[PDB]
Nucleic acid binder design. Structure first.
Length: 167
RNA sequence: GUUGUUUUUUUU
């Protein structure tokens, strides 16, 4: 947790030119990479921004986090050290009680490790949960643990066995 | 009974 940031939810048509102007506005930028699939060069939808000062980095988070750019809302946060340990940490859960909430998810899945991002898919019309959700842990061991502890078991408040697998 | 994130969080 220092100067390196990971920018998420970037519109596909965002150029390095844009990333720069946007983040440069906070303080001097060391580097700005958009991360796109080699060959086709299509944005993986995220980027890293290495500021020069730990202070500038922090402030970027405070100001740019959540700002809307065209169709998306950016999500700026400190990058976690890479590695094999961050691998296979995204979970695809289904058969979740339809009365589920972000706080229950936290209770159920938060004991096995530290959640980095979670999303309860909701019906666009009703706004009610569809029973699906994506939970992304910090370490690869937490997801594995989460999986074996919750797969095929009935969650509290529900009458149906959860389904937890790697996305 | 096949629900899939603001499709895409580790350097593409």
């Amino acid at each position: 947790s220092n100067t390196n940031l990971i920018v998420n939810y970037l519109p596909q048509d965002m150029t390095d030119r844009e990333l720069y102007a946007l983040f440069r506005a906070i303080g001097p930028i060391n580097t700005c990479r958009i991360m796109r699939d080699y060959k086709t060069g299509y944005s993986y939808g995220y980027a890293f921004v290495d500021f020069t000062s730990e202070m500038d980095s922090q402030r970027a988070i405070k100001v740019l986090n959540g700002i809307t750019v065209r169709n998306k809302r950016l999500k700026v946060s400190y990058a976690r050290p890479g590695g094999e340990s961050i691998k296979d940490t995204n979970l695809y859960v289904t058969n979740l009680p339809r009365t589920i909430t972000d706080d229950q998810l936290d209770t159920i899945f938060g004991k096995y490790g530290s959640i980095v991002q979670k999303n309860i898919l909701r019906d666009k019309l009703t706004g009610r949960p569809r029973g699906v959700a994506f939970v992304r842990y910090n370490k690869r061991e937490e997801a594995q643990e989460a999986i074996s502890a919750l797969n095929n078991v009935i969650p509290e408040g529900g009458s149906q066995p959860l389904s937890v697998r790697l996305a």
